[PDB]
Amino acid sequence: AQNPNCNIMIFHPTKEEFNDFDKYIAYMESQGAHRAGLAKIIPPKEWKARETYDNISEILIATPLQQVASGRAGVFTQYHKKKKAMTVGEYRHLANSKKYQTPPHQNFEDLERKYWKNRIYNSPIYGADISGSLFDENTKQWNLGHLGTIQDLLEKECGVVIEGVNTPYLYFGMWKTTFAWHTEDMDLYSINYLHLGEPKTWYVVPPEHGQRLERLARELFPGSSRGCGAFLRHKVALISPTVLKENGIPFNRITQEAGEFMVTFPYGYHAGFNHGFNCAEAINFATPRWIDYGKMASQCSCGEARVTFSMDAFVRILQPERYDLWKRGQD
Ligand SMILES: O=C(O)CNC(=O)C(=O)O
Ligand SMILES: [Mg+2]
Ligand code: NI
Ligand SMILES: [Zn+2]
Structure with a gap:
């Protein structure tokens, strides 16, 4: 079994290897990268996302969000x-x-x-x-x-x-x-x-150990846990590395710098923070290996998690038994 300790792996594709995205994801998995939950990809030196960032100041942030905390450090x-x-x-x-x-x-x-x-x-x-x-x-x-x-x-x-x-x-x-x-x-x-x-x-829990993190979160956030059987879908809870270590939860950490890609893998719990002014771009994607995770994914039906239009079809086709209750949550 590749990467049995579930360490975060770093990849340096050549420009030739950077052509075919699907094939490179599958390569990284052949080396065990998914076992960590997270991988870093450093692009070839010839590559660039765009020529300059000099002309981005007029993009609008229509609804900036002030992140107010409650609890202990x-x-x-x-x-x-x-x-x-x-x-x-x-x-x-x-x-x-x-x-x-x-x-x-x-x-x-x-x-x-x-x-x-x-x-x-x-x-x-x-x-x-x-x-x-x-x-x-x-x-x-x-x-x-x-x-x-x-x-x-x-x-x-x-x-x-x-x-x-x-x-x-x-x-x-x-x-x-x-x-x-x-x-x-x-x-x-x-x-x-x-x-x-x-x-x-970034902090990440290996997918094979995600349920350990969920059990800790139910203990640490006991009112939230009673309100919703999948409350981490609300995307509001933080737990420090020190607390994770005290409770024996397996995790890893890594810092991403400008010019670098990160990939998160199915059922890889992650959390993190920004060091200063920055701009990131992100999107979800799937591979054939995802299908089985999609069929087993938990869902928030309490009404808090409220998500995109396109998740409807994924629930409806992959999780038909859950569909009715989940959609009640969306409406
Ligand atoms: O960058 C952020 O604030 C959060 N990003 C992600 O959770 C991600 O790319 O999956
Ligand atoms: Mg602009
Ligand atoms: Ni994410
Ligand atoms: Zn919920």
């Missing part, structure tokens, strides 16, 4: 308070202000310590989940706006044609902006490219 939830619209140039200036900027630090480890110690005492503003792309149309390799669609994969594997579309999302971050512990909708893969700016730190 290592075990907290966050809610998102909607703020007034602002441009990317206005958001960059805000991120760089004295109130929000990254503090002085020695190295990534010192910054990580400061994040865990102090996150809860601040409410950073995240420009998350903005439909769009920063890949140039002429970039042919690993262009997240030109991937094979999940609907087409379901049709190729299962023979059923379904409605829905699959497009990328932009994330504009600042110091302390946070992504809570989650797997993807329908336990899909995700791919994330850090276009510019400061790093993003």
